């Protein structure tokens, strides 16, 4: 072992930073967030320090490095661009047995600052001794994506319940299993975060009442339009905690690979009624069910209908929104849905009853047709017949955001022509913003 | 932050443990692996301390607590079962400004020892501060089943190459690009774990030979509507690796905590558009990875087109990471789906304040959900115009303030109440008009 990680209590402990530039500013933010009684000594200071000083958050000492400033200090940081000053600081700290970091020379003095994932009171720290800061940030990134934002509130509450769980769960197998469902209970975490103290007390007693077997709940998760990177952090966390994942064709294979093989998978790509009962049945057997749907669950996803089935049965649910096809395709095709005065509104529209064509034909809109390929010849002839100018730009985006994305574009009088040239899943975008693609297309 | 994690170099530094039982032994073992010069002061010692002392790996002092034994120490650990003694140790260490752990009292004294996942020289440390040692242990096992055991050898080889990387690559960006390739090369990791130095050298030689692009980049990243969990995985990657992050006030606080700690951050809240464009242009022309972090989605009422056309006109590369737009986030978190069955044919995302003006006949049409962005100040005009162009007076409306955050507020009513409803909230807020608003009483799962 090269270094021993320790977690220091710095509240109201004198710490010293030498330096007043951006390096020192980054270190000082860290120590302020830890509650240090912070002094900063530098020949000059950047404006952020005077701001902190005027708010009484720290003390500034302008001038050359003064070793007597280390007199009552617990930690020192050398954060200048001058190697002779940093060596003076680390030498004075060493002789006082004060742990010291030289920012630009991690093996020069006595401690290294790791990458930190803060879920206080829960904290994770990653370092490799300065041999590989890029690896440390790469690992920090994975951990940040995995650890729910409000886990620390759950950790705090867990400690207050340590006594109750022991008196109810005899063996450590049992309370280990209790703690495992406790730390993944979404209703509890959001109830703690929202300061809804009655939902806390309801969730708390429901967690003690039900069998350890039962963790029944459904999460509707929007998987985004295809690219696995367009899943949300919460969405990834939910599919990592699922007992059962119910998905269909419009969920990309790259998304499905982020589900651990330890979860049951149920493929329902079958009228809507059957899907509703599947979710019902598996939530009532007490499993964590994630219903994965393409894009956003509440935008032509029939997501509402599945949740109404669950409401009439008393099964907790939540929804994780996702990137709808329009947003994904817009960003990845270089076609902004709005721009300057081009469009006062964006219309997301499907392809008994039928569409209001005069309304769709009006100016200053971006039109986005979902499930519109089969009707694309109709859409061309009717938009023209209802006054939309023949030179209106149109684009069709197929498999948007994925490695198979194809974009075709022209004007409206060639819209029906370009539509047989693509296949589902495809969006039809009509409007002046379509012209912007020649400049903004950064993708395939 | 409850604690500040630091990684201490203990080689040849005096450390004191008080106590000689099984707790002290566990801590002594750790401090010996770290290379500490270790004294153990205790009334009695379990046999393992005899084994260590015979080998000359530490100094035993048999007797009650000797405060003067702290005088040259960098760390102290109180590991007795006597809380009077433990607190004398903590007090003596405090006066000397020596960080001190009381093992049976995490909240007392001045450092805590975390759980350690060892892939030396790579190390991960986890602690919940004694609030939930069960959580720390569950997390410690997940981290174990996540970090490959190859990883220590990749990190060790990186350490050996750092001098050559600094010599051969002039700029900081080049060195970063090298390391970013180095750490994801699976063949190199396999060859290191196999001690196949022929393969190690050939892959390494090729890595050093690749042209490294020096161009700065600008990434437009949608931060989503507030909740940090609604950032995309790709958006998180970009802000974890940017040099500079240019962020609005419509980017929540929790999102900014996800920026890498050593990134520079430039505020552009309330500055006009051509201020922002130029700030991006220049830091990008400095060869730095720039992330432009905007609320919601960058291409929905975000003015992301204008910033990018300036960079295209100047030869600067760029990309766009979409985000959850306010309509989708507030929809999910208020229990108001934007489409549903027969209710809504179409969703309209509309801006509220503009220059000619809005096409109210168009907006008043039945079977749609209207979502007004930036429309608070015109709520009275919206109600009057939609009524005048034939929308039913009892049409449900909702206003979502600070959607998806812990401060989210929802008010709802009918169209004839829209103007007064808007006075009960402030920016940032959405106006939702449509029959789907009535679904809230069955689909609301978040709060109120
Ligand atoms: N990756 C993709 N590229 C282009 N269009 C897509 C797409 N994924 C879904 N779509 C569109 O969405 C339609 C299915 S309806 C479901 C839409 C989803 N809830 C969402 O928010 O996007 C398809 O007919 C297609 O037009
Ligand atoms: N968290 C939130 N809750 C409610 N409305 C929000 C919001 N965040 C942004 N908005 C809306 O967005 C308007 C700014 S326009 C910026 C919109 C952003 N690009 C997006 O895609 O959502 C605000 O006036 C408000 O109407
Ligand atoms: Cl160094
Ligand atoms: Cl490192
Ligand atoms: Cl022993």
Numbering used by the authors:
A (entry chain B): 1 to 269, 277 to 358, 363 to 455
B (entry chain A): 1 to 270, 277 to 361, 364 to 456
Question: What did the article's authors report about this structure?
Answer:
Both the R260A and R261A variants complement a cysG deficiency in E. coli grown on minimal media where SO42− is the sole sulfur source. We next determined the X-ray crystal structures of the variants to test whether these alterations changed the relationship between the enzyme modules or their overall structure. Interestingly, the culture expressing R260A, but not R261A, showed signs of precorrin-2 buildup in its pink fluorescence.
CysG is encoded by a gene fusion between a C-terminal SUMT (CysGA) and an N-terminal bifunctional dehydrogenase/ferrochelatase (CysGB).
